[PDB]
């Protein structure tokens, strides 16, 4: 059973969310199996950012057991701005554990992170949630000379999940969502003074087969990383508590995590309310 | 100074928000002046629903001092559903006090029927408002929605404290600084009740927003109707509670009605059913 352990108040520098397995913290990057049901292509998704929120929460590659923390820019908490007609993130946003885009069709290098996941179901997720999802398709975003693969997925518990099997089903049951996704990832950093991003494949979402191939490739890259066999381990903390055949296994790491110290959410500056027309 | 007095937990049937002046409840319908600065057409807006929320909170016409309470559908709490690409309400949404769309007036040429409520206000500024907030706004324009045979005027307004307020003076400025917002507004009010099993609504003027000059005259008309109502001179006041604490020339004036309101009993927001998360694709 997966649960979460929160340290600190949300929307602060001290906020951390660890994933627990049966009460014990594990690495959100390394210790959560990619596959919930390998034979049926059911994946575990680690949720970072609930739909319609702004705080840029991410699995932290650099900290032991890779808790989810709010990203920072030169010491300041990072929030995505609201880009009309959108409110914060327009998907439940997260990552597949045990995947890694090694930075060494899109002609842009890996981004050094787990593959990104856009979960499109009705229910708003929570930070640190492990949910089970099916892959529907995939887009390739080009941001600052790196490829960021975005897997389109749905919670298998969603009422519509049985009717959604491949990318064409998203156009049928969620008309306009793929267009909104294209627009959002193109423009979401413009309010921060960064350039418009671009998609490979003229913004096309490739199908489930294509998605499964990319997922598998990035899982294979992760296997090389965690075995200590990658060229550059990039200051990624590879500490893990479920993989004893790896050089960075450490059973002790779980008990070293402080107890939950859950505080009320800290206020967010009212500037984050602003709707940008860009 | 206007403040709020909350009774109960948000998102429950018991929740009420009274508007206070000097720490004492006043009528949110009758006692807040329409004009903050009449000379310059600066209005007081009563905010009911913050942008990007779902709970259908409204000034309650039939309750003494007209607190804001969540509307019900056959007694069940009403939440507006999320209609892609929108999240909840896309404006800070509320009303002008001391206005009333009189439902008793015959408009035989237009066949328009007033909706029996204060005139609705869409406030377009950057900051998300709070329920029961009294903010000062400039009117920019107006739209006319037809919903189930009733005309609902929607005033387009901006908080005078918004950084853009000095640059927003008439309806055309909204398209300049908020491109696409008026088009989205048209869509929103057309479709927002479809997930509830109601028809698509229609706008007059093929959805065009009339300008400030046109808007002021509609607002004036609804203020005139309210003056008749609060004087006890409407041919049918529809069980509206006309109790007020600031209008001595009215028959239902009573400063002491304020004292009868219970003290604040603010509780933490109640959870909202997860169904309200759902995003509806109307296509
Ligand atoms: Mg990521
Ligand atoms: Mg009505
Ligand atoms: Mg109204």
Curated annotation (Swiss-Prot), chain A:
Mg(2+) 1 binds at residues 111, 116, 148. The modification Phosphothreonine is found at residues 64, 246. Gene3D superfamilies: Inorganic pyrophosphatase (3.90.80.10). There is a cross-link at residues 234, 274 (Glycyl lysine isopeptide (Lys-Gly) (interchain with G-Cter in ubiquitin)). The active site is at residue 89. It comes from Saccharomyces cerevisiae (strain ATCC 204508 / S288c). PANTHER family: INORGANIC PYROPHOSPHATASE. The modification Phosphoserine is found at residue 261. This is Inorganic pyrophosphatase. GO terms for biological process: phosphate-containing compound metabolic process. Belongs to the PPase family. Homodimer. It comes from the Eukaryota. Signal peptide: none annotated. Mg(2+) 2 binds at residue 116. It is found in: Cytoplasm. Pfam families: Pyrophosphatase. Its EC number is 3.6.1.1.
